Amino acid sequence: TPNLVISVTKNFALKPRMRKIFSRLIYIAQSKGAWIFTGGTHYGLMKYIGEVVRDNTISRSSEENVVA
């Protein structure tokens, strides 16, 4: 693991910018090669992270991958 992120979030409503922030975070994790850590799968912010991960893989594929 070159670099691993951890996040702690319990429902929360996404804002117009927060989605951009977290999408950028996941893109950087993809670029460097990283592990993300999340607690459970109670839908909300963490579910959005999972959706971003799934979108990224099909968007790029090619070299490397990200792990939740």
Whole-number Cα distances in Å, 3 to 21, 26, 58: 18, 12, 22
Strands 34-37 and 3-6: parallel
When the beta carbons of 11 and 61 are compared against another protein, the nearer one is 61
Q: Work out how close the CB of 24 gets to another protein at its nearest, in angstroms, rounded to a whole number.
A: 12
Q: Work out how close the CB of 8 gets to another protein at its nearest, in angstroms, rounded to a whole number.
A: 26
Query: Which one among 7, 9, 31, 59 touches another protein, defined by CB under 8 A?
Result: 59
- CB neighbours (10 Å) of residue 30? 18
Binding interface with another protein (CB under 8 A): 55, 58-59
